[PDB]
Amino acid sequence: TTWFVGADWLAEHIDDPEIQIIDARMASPGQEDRNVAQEYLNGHIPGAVFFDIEALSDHTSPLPHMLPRPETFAVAMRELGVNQDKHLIVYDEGNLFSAPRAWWMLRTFGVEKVSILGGGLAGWQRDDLLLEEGAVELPEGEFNAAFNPEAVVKVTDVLLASHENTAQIIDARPAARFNAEVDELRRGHIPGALNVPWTELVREGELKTTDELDAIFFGRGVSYDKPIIVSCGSGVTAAVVLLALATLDVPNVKLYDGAWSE
Asked: With CB atoms counted within 10 Å of each terminal CB, which end of the chain scores lower, N or C?
């Protein structure tokens, strides 16, 4: 199974009404030197509305990029004019750093069909398709509160897993960050956590090949025999490991949104 779509196809459907494009680009933290929103205005796919993962996080939380309430989301999604019942196509810069997160929230919050644009934006320009400028203003889109609990685990449920190694806990952070201590656990990671740098599943704006993934996981100490939980640390890359496993058809993979009440 593949969750991506090529530019060639997206272009041949740029006008298709059952489709809607979502620009999910965003800066990596430690880069408040960027203005992702602006960039969007300066250039973006035609029809794409800005999905600001940053301004969609629960700000109440001490921890970053926390999932928002199902209603706070439904508001945002409605102003932003996104329609919960169309086939959504998500995309980011081309680094596949945040499209997975966006894709995941949209499904976690009730959108049945959601795909990611292969190669993201950079792949789009490479195919020499033009951009569109300025803010997009569509009407309010149909989108009411919905939520799929089976997508997330609690701090509690992760406590068990980690305790009796009943579920494998994966860390998407990059090696160099897995053992330092610059985020807030053992050496910065959950006890028993297996490190799987998301970057190793990415090949220019999209996931490697089934086999390439199958191998990366195997050589990282991951079996498909017990369940997998992926925790969020690098802020948002976690979703990439999720997507990569979903592509391998692994079932019930859950995202550990971080340690916060409820």
From this structure: N
Nearest CA to 243 among 233, 255, 235? Answer: 255
In units of Å, what resolution does this entry have? 2.8
- Domain check: are 135 and 241 in the same one? no
Catalytic residue numbers, as ranges: 232
188 three-class SS: coil
**Residue 48 and residue 22: Cα distance in Å, rounded?**
5
Q: Is 101 annotated as a binding residue?
A: no
Residue with tokens 């297996």: 194
Give residue 52's identity as a one-letter amino acid code: D
Find the length of the chain.
262
| Cα distances (angstroms) measured from residue 189 to each of 15, 167, 171, 174, 194 | 45, 16, 8, 12, 9
Nearest to 95, CA basis, from 204, 19, 185: 204
Element (H, E) at 103: helix 99-108
Q: Which two tokens stand for residue 130?
A: 């033009």
Host domain of residue 152:
148-262
